[PDB]
Amino acid sequence: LVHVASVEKGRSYEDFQKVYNAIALKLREDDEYDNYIGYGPVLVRLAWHISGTWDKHDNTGGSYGGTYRFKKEFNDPSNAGLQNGFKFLEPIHKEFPWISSGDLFSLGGVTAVQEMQGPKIPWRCGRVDTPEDTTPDNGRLPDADKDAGYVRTFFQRLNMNDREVVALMGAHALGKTHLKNSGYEGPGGAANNVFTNEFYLNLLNEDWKLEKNDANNEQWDSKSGYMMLPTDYSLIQDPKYLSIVKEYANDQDKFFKDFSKAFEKLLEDGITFPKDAPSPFIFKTLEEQGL
Numbered sequence: 001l002v003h004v005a006s007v008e009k010g011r012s013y014e015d016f017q018k019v020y021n022a023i024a025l026k027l028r029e030d031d032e033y034d035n036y037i038g039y040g041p042v043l044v045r046l047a048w049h050i051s052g053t054w055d056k057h058d059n060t061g062g063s064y065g066g067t068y069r070f071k072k073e074f075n076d077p078s079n080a081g082l083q084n085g086f087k088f089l090e091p092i093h094k095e096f097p098w099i100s101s102g103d104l105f106s107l108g109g110v111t112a113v114q115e116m117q118g119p120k121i122p123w124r125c126g127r128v129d130t131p132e133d134t135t136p137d138n139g140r141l142p143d144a145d146k147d148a149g150y151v152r153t154f155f156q157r158l159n160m161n162d163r164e165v166v167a168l169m170g171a172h173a174l175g176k177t178h179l180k181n182s183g184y185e186g187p188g189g190a191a192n193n194v195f196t197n198e199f200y201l202n203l204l205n206e207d208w209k210l211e212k213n214d215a216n217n218e219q220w221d222s223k224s225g226y227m228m229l230p231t232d233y234s235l236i237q238d239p240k241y242l243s244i245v246k247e248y249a250n251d252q253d254k255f256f257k258d259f260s261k262a263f264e265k266l267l268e269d270g271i272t273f274p275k276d277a278p279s280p281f282i283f284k285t286l287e288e289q290g291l
């Protein structure tokens, strides 16, 4: 399999910037969602999920084909709750129908991040919708009840090393877990709609208590009212992960640089960018444009 990036016919930077602005304006307006968290989080999750199905071995999965739009994928149990981000984007797609699905799902993720004060994430267009039969089977997304070995192992399928994994996981500071969705419940910290290194701080400074929740699943709960999944917790159990957590707990910039590179890589896995391809775009935030 080769997925070559193909620019949507005749579109350019400015075209993309408008999709971005549209997404951002909607994020701004629909702030009541999930009790005032806003849709930032969910979109980030969405972007990650359409991309985590990737298999470095045979190049199936990944964000290129927008397969999430098909039943198989859309109905994947690991994707429960994502339908709300989809619905959020639907009107957008209506407004700019020439954008591919994979471009759109991934763009929301980027938009989200940057709108929530995170770092700028360069992004590339070119994804191409693929047929229903390209939709990967369910089960390619990781489980939360495991440990560090699982995580290392899992992420390797995506070519991500230890540093990437830890950076990437720092997104856990956002939003929260929801009972109905994954059998987990609770936020991980206080600023759950603004992008910070809070994740790492929490993991290191709170006093975590292992407990079972209402779905009969175990989770690490803190006095402050926060939670961490076992997979999150596992970043402190592994010596190698641990030193990284510590690094980011100490330097928000490092964290941002690292996250930025990783997230893009994550969203570009399995895609071949030809030579003539435009460079990656760096979008302006609403605020940068005074809108």
Ligand code: HEM
Residues within 6 Å of the ligand: 041, 042, 044, 045, 048, 081, 142, 143, 144, 151, 168, 169, 171, 172, 174, 175, 176, 177, 178, 179, 180, 181, 182, 183, 184, 229, 231
């Ligand atoms: C071991 C790896 C991962 C596991 C097992 C994990 C699994 C989960 C779980 C169980 C949920 C809660 C869903 C719900 O009930 O709403 C979720 C929340 C979330 N996931 Fe992950 N995830 C991990 C990797 C990632 C990474 C790489 C990203 C993005 C870079 C990410 C971003 C998020 C976000 C932003 C939320 C909050 C969603 C909301 O507020 O609706 N996670 N994670």
